[PDB]
Amino acid sequence: LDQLRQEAEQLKNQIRDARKACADATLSQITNNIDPVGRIQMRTRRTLRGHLAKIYAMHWGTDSRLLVSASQDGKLIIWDSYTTNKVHAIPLRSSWVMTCAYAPSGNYVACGGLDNICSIYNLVRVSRELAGHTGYLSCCRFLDDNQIVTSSGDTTCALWDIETGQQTTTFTGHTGDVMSLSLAPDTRLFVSGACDASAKLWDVREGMCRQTFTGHESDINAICFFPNGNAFATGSDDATCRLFDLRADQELMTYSHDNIICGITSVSFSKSGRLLLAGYDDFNCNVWDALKADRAGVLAGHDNRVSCLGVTDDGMAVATGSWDSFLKIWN
Amino acid sequence: SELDQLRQEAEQLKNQIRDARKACADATLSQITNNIDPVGRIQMRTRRTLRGHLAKIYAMHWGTDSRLLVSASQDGKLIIWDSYTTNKVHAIPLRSSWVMTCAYAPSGNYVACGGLDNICSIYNLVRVSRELAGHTGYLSCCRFLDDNQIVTSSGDTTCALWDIETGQQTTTFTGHTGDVMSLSLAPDTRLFVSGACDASAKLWDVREGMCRQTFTGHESDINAICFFPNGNAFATGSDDATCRLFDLRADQELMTYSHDNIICGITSVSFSKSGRLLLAGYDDFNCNVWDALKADRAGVLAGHDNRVSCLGVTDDGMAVATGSWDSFLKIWN
Amino acid sequence: LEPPTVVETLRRGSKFIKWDEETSSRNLVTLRVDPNGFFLYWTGPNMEVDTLDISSIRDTRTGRYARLPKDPKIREVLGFARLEEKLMTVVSGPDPVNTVFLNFMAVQDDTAKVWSEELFKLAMNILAQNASRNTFLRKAYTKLKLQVNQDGRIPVKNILKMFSADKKRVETALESCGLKFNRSESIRPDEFSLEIFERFLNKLCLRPDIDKILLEIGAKGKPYLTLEQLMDFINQKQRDPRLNEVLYPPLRPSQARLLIEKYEPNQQFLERDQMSMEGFSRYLGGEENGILPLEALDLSTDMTQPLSAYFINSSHNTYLTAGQLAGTSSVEMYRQALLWGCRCVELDVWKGRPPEEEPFITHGFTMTTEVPLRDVLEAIAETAFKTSPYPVILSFENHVDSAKQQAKMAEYCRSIFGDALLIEPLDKYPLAPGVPLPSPQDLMGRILVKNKKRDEGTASSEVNATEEMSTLVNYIEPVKFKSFEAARKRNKCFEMSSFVETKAMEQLTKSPMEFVEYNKQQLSRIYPKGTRVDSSNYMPQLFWNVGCQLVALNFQTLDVAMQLNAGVFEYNGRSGYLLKPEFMRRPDKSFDPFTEVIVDGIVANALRVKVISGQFLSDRKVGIYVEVDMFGLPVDTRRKYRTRTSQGNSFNPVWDEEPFDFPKVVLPTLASLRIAAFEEGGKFVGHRILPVSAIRSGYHYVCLRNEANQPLCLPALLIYTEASDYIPSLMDQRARQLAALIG
Amino acid sequence: SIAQARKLVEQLKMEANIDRIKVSKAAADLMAYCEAHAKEDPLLTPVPASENPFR
Amino acid sequence: SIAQARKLVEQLKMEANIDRIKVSKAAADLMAYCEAHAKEDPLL
Ligand SMILES: [Ca+2]
């Protein structure tokens, strides 16, 4: 029985020494020719109000105009980020929501929460009801108008089919609560973070884990993508954003600072990739420079824990939503 | 049967020494001076009370300018006082609270320190200038020879002379058996004395770096030792409540300043400027002025609550300042 | 006995729903327990961490016993068959009357049974209540470290609020160790360690009362103590001479080397076998320098003696929460009495209404509130053997006269209690004249019924027994009291008698030497008189001298008589069964309970207690005194003692005054010392009840519990006890001896 | 516990035999992307306030 | 511990050959030092 653990240890030692031999340079050293960015000032322009309880998640429309905001009081308001007009107010039959999504087209909106089922709407009425998770729902992302991928707290991810309500591929291979997941911009292979301090990279075709990533010491609350689909930034609960590589299977940069002790909630990259944004428990949001590992600004307007943060598709605005039932659109 | 010859050669030379001592023993200081006048009633008064520390006070030292004084506390915070207008002109925090000594420069620029962390942290008049490491025991007392030399006394039975710029043990003084507790420099700044725990003070020369006159006599520790102002005598306050007075030119013990009604040990001795009064502080919260030429008490300085752990006269005799274990420091005149 | 361990599911955490009934609020928190087993912390609704002290948790109940929501909004939110198997309520409070409910519904299956069981196993530990001074000083550190603010930092209002006596010394001792010391600032929790906390505690208050201890043993000029100077401190001052020197041997130097290696930070003295002045101040609060040994606090008693040879915890009219005349009867006090260590509760049953036959429980003719009998029997069957598996004695006070309800309550007690009832006598002890009662070892986990078989208030005018309710009463059968010379001739040990206090104080003074002989075979029970309408308490030490087992006391009021009753039953595993001394359970060896001289057969003792000093005793600048009472036989009772009031000079006051001298105690195995610290002005601070037969001698730390025997965190006292063996008109003569014990 | 003990040694084996380009080349491509696409990134560059959709 | 007895008697032999100034003249020098310096002590 122990010989299996010995050959597994030798097999992962072949990952260890190949990581060491592939670590020949350092991105903290290559960027020393690059001139810094310095001061970046963002300001509140649209304060979307109208909720009653704490906001748990949000997602931007594909045309960067409408955004859905899932609050704890059983409500999915779909706003207009240009004129501040509540286009819809969707009442769900469950109080505890954790996630909400939007469509690549712009007609479907998913949700989910503690009731273990992913309610898909239509733009209103529930169209489909997706049951089959043994634990609660954490985060859900559409692929197209017919497919969704969900991440549950019973140590798995699932890939559904909307028209038939059947789980196509069930990604298992974790051993902790999958708290967040993020999708590639071309929607071919996605990532998933857990409460094991280990990100994984899954694919939607073969259903297998191709790469694994370690490094943290706590849960992983947020993952985004570099906008070309080659890197990702696992924001965690020990105040350390990182940056990884899909090719070298190695961590590249770490965004750590004293006077930042609180764990973090939601990260997001920029449209180019020079910036990074994170949301902290100390009610603030610190723009990190993605190459020189220094701050560039402070988005401090919130009065409670910044629970969700999202950047548009044309890169113009960011939108934050915290536990004080308010959303703020910075520009 | 070879070590018995070395042991008998050891003890027979002790016998040859102790016969040469009683060969010089002719009289005593009281029998010689017994027609001199007494001193009388020396009634003193607390001039200032320098509050400001937060723990016990283990050592102090007077400046050579007779105006300022340093006082090493136990929270890890030296304070340099201005004894005329009571203002704390300096307040230096440390890296280790357990501090057993301090010092002051003859120039007036370098204040040393020490304690349980084996090192002597020479400061500048503020920041750490050096960290003199190399001892393997606690650092009991350390004194300034000049602006370039310092001499320590550590609890690994060794004294040492150091170099303040390179930080190396220049000359090393070895030959004790118990922990070295106190130390004092002569006025010609060329020889000191080392009162270790095993009832024995020795006489070291700083240039040849080896002992030349070893005294015995007590039955306990030696917690204090301080020179007469001519560089010919001193006084070794001890734990069995016996202050003595030895002589350098005679290599014998002259007086024993014992008493009934007192069984508590000494924590600090000092002579005066005139060499008439042997100010000694006791471990029962009271200081008693001993008349040095008649071995009798002459004044009572009792104003402290806990034990008096450090005492020191100035270099013109205008003041005497006591510091005790109750975070207060009084200047007596 | 086992130290408190926290399993790896409580440290990692679990998700819950903290719901609430009055505010109708709800949140999804994650409960954690720190690895010392000290607190229960969860992130609040605005990121400020809340705590719950785990030594204040009275009970954690799960399943059908947990509280259900009574508001349809919260019921619609939560999901309201087996969904109520994920509920959990944790109760907490200072006293049995005033408790506060914390409601936690789990979001995952199976994380409520373990989360309730492993909190009740942690809240009912012995070594977490009799912890030393070092543990209670590392608890106040964790209370500061876990209560971070919104950023994740130890705030500076907290360290000024915990040590809230003065404010100059706190800010100065913060500035003197390299920390931040303003009024609105914060300290990062990785630069505020345990050593940077204790080096702030040492700069906080000055300790000359340990300097005197070090002067007495010989720490003259060296900054350490040797090996022999510590071994001949322990074996000379910290050794109680009453123990036999063969099976409790003195200290070898190899154990003092282990003590030096454990308690000392400096590495110079650690290799030459020496101990510094900080390694001694860390020894005086050590786990080996305890005021009581760990054999006077666990279940170590001969539990096979008959049931008439034990003091038994008892209560009288348990259902009330206030005075007897205008109170409000509740069912929760049956839980908070049987969990607290009681073993005998009273049921004042009454006759139901012609709407439907249901017996209810209330005080008769007093306009109180009425609770029903079935819920009370449900509560008694719930919280019976959760703390200690020793038999409860249900003392019915029957008042139903209709034959329907007398058969209703005979099936209530047979369907609710089930097999835990005793309906038939045992195989070894039949109900014959001349047999002894069965031991509490042989009645483990049973419930005995006390009811009639075929100035007192409403306990005199009872209702006669029927053939249906009196099938239950076999071993504890109450009769009417004739005389001791009449009860002695019957030789039936399976009866009892129930005296009111005014009628018990007429055979206490008259003939106690027959009274002690009566309490060697049969039981007794004393309830206070009906004129105490404010629910006052008589002293139980009056009737514990003559031998009375079931001395019943009001549990809702906490005066001195209830503090002694709740402190004397903490020992012997909190089981409520304390053994009698040997001359109150032997048949031949009689003695006088009012004697003034020592008795041949009982080894006397002598006790000298000197109050040195004590720390952190208040939260404002006011003086402190200390009362040292002593209860027991009426010649050992001396409550006149009191120290002088200090001036509030520091965090710790020091008292400089003569010892207290208890020169002769006639029966030491029954007496108990009471050290209670007060403020100047009558305010109470803390107290502790220590048995004299097992107290220790030397320089020790007494850790003061509060008014209802729960451990306070910061306050303590340092005392010097010296305990050693002794070296050599009747109704007024016996009623002037009890003038101190009565009040 | 045993089928998982074969699944893990399969999962590490299918991970170990992959192509691992150097961190120098990866950081070179990652650095080359940012200023090549930074001309059309409205977070770093300020906004013409007439064409700003939110002003 | 063989050379320690030689190292002891070396310092003893160095202690032996020194000068022997008498106690009466030493105490007279002490009194002559005190009587010539008792004019500048502000305590006295
Ligand atoms: Ca009653």
JSON list of C-alpha atoms in Angstrom, two decimals, chain C residues 225-368:
[
{"chain": "C", "resi": 225, "resn": "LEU", "atom": "CA", "xyz": [18.69, 30.70, 41.93]},
{"chain": "C", "resi": 226, "resn": "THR", "atom": "CA", "xyz": [20.66, 27.46, 42.08]},
{"chain": "C", "resi": 227, "resn": "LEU", "atom": "CA", "xyz": [19.22, 23.94, 42.00]},
{"chain": "C", "resi": 228, "resn": "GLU", "atom": "CA", "xyz": [19.38, 23.35, 45.76]},
{"chain": "C", "resi": 229, "resn": "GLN", "atom": "CA", "xyz": [17.99, 26.83, 46.54]},
{"chain": "C", "resi": 230, "resn": "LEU", "atom": "CA", "xyz": [14.84, 25.88, 44.58]},
{"chain": "C", "resi": 231, "resn": "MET", "atom": "CA", "xyz": [14.55, 22.26, 45.73]},
{"chain": "C", "resi": 232, "resn": "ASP", "atom": "CA", "xyz": [14.89, 23.41, 49.37]},
{"chain": "C", "resi": 233, "resn": "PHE", "atom": "CA", "xyz": [12.25, 26.01, 48.68]},
{"chain": "C", "resi": 234, "resn": "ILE", "atom": "CA", "xyz": [9.76, 23.48, 47.30]},
{"chain": "C", "resi": 235, "resn": "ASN", "atom": "CA", "xyz": [10.37, 20.72, 49.87]},
{"chain": "C", "resi": 236, "resn": "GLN", "atom": "CA", "xyz": [10.42, 23.22, 52.77]},
{"chain": "C", "resi": 237, "resn": "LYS", "atom": "CA", "xyz": [7.67, 25.78, 52.06]},
{"chain": "C", "resi": 238, "resn": "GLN", "atom": "CA", "xyz": [5.56, 24.29, 49.25]},
{"chain": "C", "resi": 239, "resn": "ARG", "atom": "CA", "xyz": [5.10, 20.87, 50.89]},
{"chain": "C", "resi": 240, "resn": "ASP", "atom": "CA", "xyz": [1.97, 20.11, 52.89]},
{"chain": "C", "resi": 241, "resn": "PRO", "atom": "CA", "xyz": [3.08, 18.15, 56.00]},
{"chain": "C", "resi": 242, "resn": "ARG", "atom": "CA", "xyz": [-0.23, 16.32, 56.49]},
{"chain": "C", "resi": 243, "resn": "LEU", "atom": "CA", "xyz": [0.52, 13.76, 53.76]},
{"chain": "C", "resi": 244, "resn": "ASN", "atom": "CA", "xyz": [2.33, 10.51, 54.46]},
{"chain": "C", "resi": 245, "resn": "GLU", "atom": "CA", "xyz": [5.96, 10.78, 53.29]},
{"chain": "C", "resi": 246, "resn": "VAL", "atom": "CA", "xyz": [6.06, 7.22, 51.77]},
{"chain": "C", "resi": 247, "resn": "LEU", "atom": "CA", "xyz": [3.57, 7.41, 48.90]},
{"chain": "C", "resi": 248, "resn": "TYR", "atom": "CA", "xyz": [3.93, 11.18, 48.31]},
{"chain": "C", "resi": 249, "resn": "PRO", "atom": "CA", "xyz": [7.72, 11.50, 48.25]},
{"chain": "C", "resi": 250, "resn": "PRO", "atom": "CA", "xyz": [9.62, 14.81, 48.25]},
{"chain": "C", "resi": 251, "resn": "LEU", "atom": "CA", "xyz": [11.33, 16.27, 45.19]},
{"chain": "C", "resi": 252, "resn": "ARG", "atom": "CA", "xyz": [14.46, 14.69, 43.77]},
{"chain": "C", "resi": 253, "resn": "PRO", "atom": "CA", "xyz": [16.82, 17.07, 41.92]},
{"chain": "C", "resi": 254, "resn": "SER", "atom": "CA", "xyz": [16.03, 15.39, 38.58]},
{"chain": "C", "resi": 255, "resn": "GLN", "atom": "CA", "xyz": [12.48, 16.74, 38.75]},
{"chain": "C", "resi": 256, "resn": "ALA", "atom": "CA", "xyz": [13.66, 20.24, 39.67]},
{"chain": "C", "resi": 257, "resn": "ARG", "atom": "CA", "xyz": [15.91, 20.04, 36.61]},
{"chain": "C", "resi": 258, "resn": "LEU", "atom": "CA", "xyz": [12.77, 19.33, 34.55]},
{"chain": "C", "resi": 259, "resn": "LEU", "atom": "CA", "xyz": [11.05, 22.33, 36.16]},
{"chain": "C", "resi": 260, "resn": "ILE", "atom": "CA", "xyz": [14.05, 24.56, 35.37]},
{"chain": "C", "resi": 261, "resn": "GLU", "atom": "CA", "xyz": [14.09, 23.26, 31.79]},
{"chain": "C", "resi": 262, "resn": "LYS", "atom": "CA", "xyz": [10.37, 23.94, 31.39]},
{"chain": "C", "resi": 263, "resn": "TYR", "atom": "CA", "xyz": [9.96, 27.39, 32.92]},
{"chain": "C", "resi": 264, "resn": "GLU", "atom": "CA", "xyz": [13.09, 29.31, 32.04]},
{"chain": "C", "resi": 265, "resn": "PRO", "atom": "CA", "xyz": [13.78, 31.42, 28.92]},
{"chain": "C", "resi": 266, "resn": "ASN", "atom": "CA", "xyz": [17.49, 32.19, 29.38]},
{"chain": "C", "resi": 267, "resn": "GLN", "atom": "CA", "xyz": [19.96, 29.70, 27.91]},
{"chain": "C", "resi": 268, "resn": "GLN", "atom": "CA", "xyz": [22.91, 30.59, 30.18]},
{"chain": "C", "resi": 269, "resn": "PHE", "atom": "CA", "xyz": [21.32, 29.22, 33.36]},
{"chain": "C", "resi": 270, "resn": "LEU", "atom": "CA", "xyz": [19.59, 26.36, 31.53]},
{"chain": "C", "resi": 271, "resn": "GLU", "atom": "CA", "xyz": [22.88, 24.47, 31.10]},
{"chain": "C", "resi": 272, "resn": "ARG", "atom": "CA", "xyz": [24.32, 25.11, 34.58]},
{"chain": "C", "resi": 273, "resn": "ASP", "atom": "CA", "xyz": [21.04, 24.02, 36.29]},
{"chain": "C", "resi": 274, "resn": "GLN", "atom": "CA", "xyz": [20.01, 27.48, 37.49]},
{"chain": "C", "resi": 275, "resn": "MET", "atom": "CA", "xyz": [16.75, 29.43, 37.41]},
{"chain": "C", "resi": 276, "resn": "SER", "atom": "CA", "xyz": [16.43, 33.16, 36.79]},
{"chain": "C", "resi": 277, "resn": "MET", "atom": "CA", "xyz": [14.00, 35.66, 38.33]},
{"chain": "C", "resi": 278, "resn": "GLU", "atom": "CA", "xyz": [11.61, 35.33, 35.39]},
{"chain": "C", "resi": 279, "resn": "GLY", "atom": "CA", "xyz": [11.79, 31.53, 35.47]},
{"chain": "C", "resi": 280, "resn": "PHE", "atom": "CA", "xyz": [10.55, 31.70, 39.06]},
{"chain": "C", "resi": 281, "resn": "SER", "atom": "CA", "xyz": [7.71, 34.14, 38.43]},
{"chain": "C", "resi": 282, "resn": "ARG", "atom": "CA", "xyz": [6.71, 31.71, 35.68]},
{"chain": "C", "resi": 283, "resn": "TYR", "atom": "CA", "xyz": [6.90, 28.91, 38.25]},
{"chain": "C", "resi": 284, "resn": "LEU", "atom": "CA", "xyz": [4.56, 30.49, 40.82]},
{"chain": "C", "resi": 285, "resn": "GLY", "atom": "CA", "xyz": [1.76, 30.31, 38.26]},
{"chain": "C", "resi": 286, "resn": "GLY", "atom": "CA", "xyz": [2.74, 26.88, 37.01]},
{"chain": "C", "resi": 287, "resn": "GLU", "atom": "CA", "xyz": [0.57, 23.81, 36.68]},
{"chain": "C", "resi": 288, "resn": "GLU", "atom": "CA", "xyz": [2.43, 22.08, 39.52]},
{"chain": "C", "resi": 289, "resn": "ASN", "atom": "CA", "xyz": [2.06, 25.04, 41.91]},
{"chain": "C", "resi": 290, "resn": "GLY", "atom": "CA", "xyz": [-1.69, 24.68, 42.30]},
{"chain": "C", "resi": 291, "resn": "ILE", "atom": "CA", "xyz": [-3.74, 25.49, 45.37]},
{"chain": "C", "resi": 292, "resn": "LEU", "atom": "CA", "xyz": [-5.56, 22.12, 45.22]},
{"chain": "C", "resi": 293, "resn": "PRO", "atom": "CA", "xyz": [-4.22, 18.78, 43.93]},
{"chain": "C", "resi": 294, "resn": "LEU", "atom": "CA", "xyz": [-5.88, 16.96, 41.06]},
{"chain": "C", "resi": 295, "resn": "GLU", "atom": "CA", "xyz": [-7.22, 14.20, 43.32]},
{"chain": "C", "resi": 296, "resn": "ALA", "atom": "CA", "xyz": [-9.55, 16.58, 45.18]},
{"chain": "C", "resi": 297, "resn": "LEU", "atom": "CA", "xyz": [-11.34, 17.52, 41.95]},
{"chain": "C", "resi": 298, "resn": "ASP", "atom": "CA", "xyz": [-12.10, 14.26, 40.10]},
{"chain": "C", "resi": 299, "resn": "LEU", "atom": "CA", "xyz": [-14.37, 11.32, 40.91]},
{"chain": "C", "resi": 300, "resn": "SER", "atom": "CA", "xyz": [-12.21, 9.65, 43.58]},
{"chain": "C", "resi": 301, "resn": "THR", "atom": "CA", "xyz": [-14.58, 8.53, 46.35]},
{"chain": "C", "resi": 302, "resn": "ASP", "atom": "CA", "xyz": [-15.76, 5.20, 47.75]},
{"chain": "C", "resi": 303, "resn": "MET", "atom": "CA", "xyz": [-19.02, 5.15, 45.79]},
{"chain": "C", "resi": 304, "resn": "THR", "atom": "CA", "xyz": [-20.23, 1.84, 47.27]},
{"chain": "C", "resi": 305, "resn": "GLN", "atom": "CA", "xyz": [-21.45, 3.08, 50.66]},
{"chain": "C", "resi": 306, "resn": "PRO", "atom": "CA", "xyz": [-25.25, 3.12, 51.19]},
{"chain": "C", "resi": 307, "resn": "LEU", "atom": "CA", "xyz": [-27.32, 6.03, 49.90]},
{"chain": "C", "resi": 308, "resn": "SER", "atom": "CA", "xyz": [-27.92, 7.40, 53.42]},
{"chain": "C", "resi": 309, "resn": "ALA", "atom": "CA", "xyz": [-24.15, 8.03, 53.81]},
{"chain": "C", "resi": 310, "resn": "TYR", "atom": "CA", "xyz": [-23.76, 10.84, 51.26]},
{"chain": "C", "resi": 311, "resn": "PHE", "atom": "CA", "xyz": [-24.47, 14.53, 51.10]},
{"chain": "C", "resi": 312, "resn": "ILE", "atom": "CA", "xyz": [-26.77, 15.00, 48.11]},
{"chain": "C", "resi": 313, "resn": "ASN", "atom": "CA", "xyz": [-27.33, 18.19, 46.14]},
{"chain": "C", "resi": 314, "resn": "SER", "atom": "CA", "xyz": [-30.96, 19.20, 46.34]},
{"chain": "C", "resi": 315, "resn": "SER", "atom": "CA", "xyz": [-33.38, 21.96, 45.44]},
{"chain": "C", "resi": 316, "resn": "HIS", "atom": "CA", "xyz": [-36.75, 23.16, 46.72]},
{"chain": "C", "resi": 317, "resn": "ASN", "atom": "CA", "xyz": [-39.55, 24.51, 44.48]},
{"chain": "C", "resi": 318, "resn": "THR", "atom": "CA", "xyz": [-37.31, 24.48, 41.44]},
{"chain": "C", "resi": 319, "resn": "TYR", "atom": "CA", "xyz": [-39.81, 25.80, 38.89]},
{"chain": "C", "resi": 320, "resn": "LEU", "atom": "CA", "xyz": [-39.86, 29.40, 40.13]},
{"chain": "C", "resi": 321, "resn": "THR", "atom": "CA", "xyz": [-37.57, 32.21, 38.99]},
{"chain": "C", "resi": 322, "resn": "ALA", "atom": "CA", "xyz": [-38.49, 34.80, 41.65]},
{"chain": "C", "resi": 323, "resn": "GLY", "atom": "CA", "xyz": [-40.11, 34.99, 45.07]},
{"chain": "C", "resi": 324, "resn": "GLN", "atom": "CA", "xyz": [-42.68, 32.44, 46.14]},
{"chain": "C", "resi": 325, "resn": "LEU", "atom": "CA", "xyz": [-45.65, 34.82, 46.14]},
{"chain": "C", "resi": 326, "resn": "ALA", "atom": "CA", "xyz": [-45.54, 36.73, 42.84]},
{"chain": "C", "resi": 327, "resn": "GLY", "atom": "CA", "xyz": [-43.08, 34.77, 40.73]},
{"chain": "C", "resi": 328, "resn": "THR", "atom": "CA", "xyz": [-43.28, 33.19, 37.30]},
{"chain": "C", "resi": 329, "resn": "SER", "atom": "CA", "xyz": [-42.82, 29.43, 37.09]},
{"chain": "C", "resi": 330, "resn": "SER", "atom": "CA", "xyz": [-40.71, 28.18, 34.19]},
{"chain": "C", "resi": 331, "resn": "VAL", "atom": "CA", "xyz": [-39.65, 24.86, 32.73]},
{"chain": "C", "resi": 332, "resn": "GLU", "atom": "CA", "xyz": [-36.10, 26.04, 31.96]},
{"chain": "C", "resi": 333, "resn": "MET", "atom": "CA", "xyz": [-35.01, 25.91, 35.61]},
{"chain": "C", "resi": 334, "resn": "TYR", "atom": "CA", "xyz": [-35.47, 22.13, 35.61]},
{"chain": "C", "resi": 335, "resn": "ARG", "atom": "CA", "xyz": [-32.79, 22.10, 32.92]},
{"chain": "C", "resi": 336, "resn": "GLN", "atom": "CA", "xyz": [-30.48, 24.66, 34.54]},
{"chain": "C", "resi": 337, "resn": "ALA", "atom": "CA", "xyz": [-30.72, 22.90, 37.91]},
{"chain": "C", "resi": 338, "resn": "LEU", "atom": "CA", "xyz": [-30.14, 19.32, 36.74]},
{"chain": "C", "resi": 339, "resn": "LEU", "atom": "CA", "xyz": [-27.27, 20.46, 34.51]},
{"chain": "C", "resi": 340, "resn": "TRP", "atom": "CA", "xyz": [-25.71, 22.47, 37.35]},
{"chain": "C", "resi": 341, "resn": "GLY", "atom": "CA", "xyz": [-25.28, 19.38, 39.52]},
{"chain": "C", "resi": 342, "resn": "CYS", "atom": "CA", "xyz": [-28.56, 18.96, 41.38]},
{"chain": "C", "resi": 343, "resn": "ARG", "atom": "CA", "xyz": [-30.01, 15.54, 42.17]},
{"chain": "C", "resi": 344, "resn": "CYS", "atom": "CA", "xyz": [-33.44, 16.14, 43.77]},
{"chain": "C", "resi": 345, "resn": "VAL", "atom": "CA", "xyz": [-36.11, 18.37, 42.23]},
{"chain": "C", "resi": 346, "resn": "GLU", "atom": "CA", "xyz": [-39.62, 19.12, 43.48]},
{"chain": "C", "resi": 347, "resn": "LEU", "atom": "CA", "xyz": [-42.88, 18.80, 41.51]},
{"chain": "C", "resi": 348, "resn": "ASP", "atom": "CA", "xyz": [-45.88, 20.75, 42.85]},
{"chain": "C", "resi": 349, "resn": "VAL", "atom": "CA", "xyz": [-48.52, 18.95, 40.79]},
{"chain": "C", "resi": 350, "resn": "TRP", "atom": "CA", "xyz": [-52.11, 20.25, 40.78]},
{"chain": "C", "resi": 351, "resn": "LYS", "atom": "CA", "xyz": [-55.53, 19.22, 39.48]},
{"chain": "C", "resi": 352, "resn": "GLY", "atom": "CA", "xyz": [-56.53, 19.94, 35.90]},
{"chain": "C", "resi": 353, "resn": "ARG", "atom": "CA", "xyz": [-59.56, 21.72, 34.44]},
{"chain": "C", "resi": 354, "resn": "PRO", "atom": "CA", "xyz": [-62.87, 20.21, 33.23]},
{"chain": "C", "resi": 355, "resn": "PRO", "atom": "CA", "xyz": [-61.98, 21.26, 29.65]},
{"chain": "C", "resi": 356, "resn": "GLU", "atom": "CA", "xyz": [-59.52, 18.33, 29.62]},
{"chain": "C", "resi": 357, "resn": "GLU", "atom": "CA", "xyz": [-57.56, 16.34, 32.19]},
{"chain": "C", "resi": 358, "resn": "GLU", "atom": "CA", "xyz": [-54.01, 17.66, 32.27]},
{"chain": "C", "resi": 359, "resn": "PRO", "atom": "CA", "xyz": [-52.04, 18.09, 35.52]},
{"chain": "C", "resi": 360, "resn": "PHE", "atom": "CA", "xyz": [-50.12, 21.34, 35.84]},
{"chain": "C", "resi": 361, "resn": "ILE", "atom": "CA", "xyz": [-47.32, 22.47, 38.15]},
{"chain": "C", "resi": 362, "resn": "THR", "atom": "CA", "xyz": [-47.57, 25.70, 40.14]},
{"chain": "C", "resi": 363, "resn": "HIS", "atom": "CA", "xyz": [-47.36, 27.10, 43.64]},
{"chain": "C", "resi": 364, "resn": "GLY", "atom": "CA", "xyz": [-50.79, 26.79, 45.24]},
{"chain": "C", "resi": 365, "resn": "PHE", "atom": "CA", "xyz": [-53.06, 29.82, 45.83]},
{"chain": "C", "resi": 366, "resn": "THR", "atom": "CA", "xyz": [-50.36, 32.32, 44.87]},
{"chain": "C", "resi": 367, "resn": "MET", "atom": "CA", "xyz": [-51.33, 33.65, 41.37]},
{"chain": "C", "resi": 368, "resn": "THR", "atom": "CA", "xyz": [-48.13, 32.45, 39.72]}
]
